[PDB]
Amino acid sequence: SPIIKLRNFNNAIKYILIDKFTRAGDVVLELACGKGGDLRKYGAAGISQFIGIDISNASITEALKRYHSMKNLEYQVILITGDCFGESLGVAVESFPECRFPCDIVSCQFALHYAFETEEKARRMLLNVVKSLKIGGYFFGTIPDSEFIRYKMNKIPESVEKPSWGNSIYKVTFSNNEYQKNGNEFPSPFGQMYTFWLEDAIDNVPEYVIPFESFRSLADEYGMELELQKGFNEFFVEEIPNWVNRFSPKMREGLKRSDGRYGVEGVEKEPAAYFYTTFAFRKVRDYQ
């Protein structure tokens, strides 16, 4: 089962990415925060307030349960059940006036691509982000890498009805081959759907491509400029020397490969390190 090693790798990526842009005293808004599993990472950066929002009440209930189990934190934690992509964020936070907006950081891990189901949702997400963020603040996170996806798709001929690739532990299957029928181009940046099988994975939902060039050009339209687009492989290799020994002994041990180097290995390398990319934008102007 690859789940344990992949979870450790993603936790290392998130730890490094959070530290890269988050500063002590910051207010953080985390979109689609899930079960709130990055609280100690933001605590390590010394934040002052965490606001986490997820559409799943079950996941927010678990985040509440995990948070209340911790003791004497120096930062406030706010956890909200709400829709970050298909509705104005004002609806979600209306009943939470303790939120300190505008915030310093908007983060979103393994979830922003769901906002690309439609153009309306992608734009609502982006307007949500820039309305919450201070000028100068950062928007960062982790998403499936549309450029690796297009590489794999360009190797698949039009004769394949449901373009697919993978290895012993994962498989991507697209709903249709309109990409290939359209001369190896998505007919629309939005609504390009696939499923993702991972061995021993605990969830399965419709996935959507987030074409990075469309992401970047919409973000610019809403006042944000690109700061970071490194794939997980390059991001980890570049950053790990400076971090190996800053990690806890347990985090370091969980990252060990069979050869004693750090990261993932074998069949885990492609789904864990090539399929995903980091992103970061800085809000440089107000949106008109």
Ligand SMILES: Nc1ncnc2c1ncn2[C@@H]1O[C@H](C[C@@H](N)CC[C@H](N)C(=O)O)[C@@H](O)[C@H]1O
């Ligand atoms: N419209 C939406 N608004 C808010 N959260 C959403 C929405 N659509 C999906 N989600 C959440 O997106 C999350 C996707 C997860 N893959 C990631 C959760 C968490 N960020 C983690 O990395 O563990 C789930 O927790 C969903 O409930």
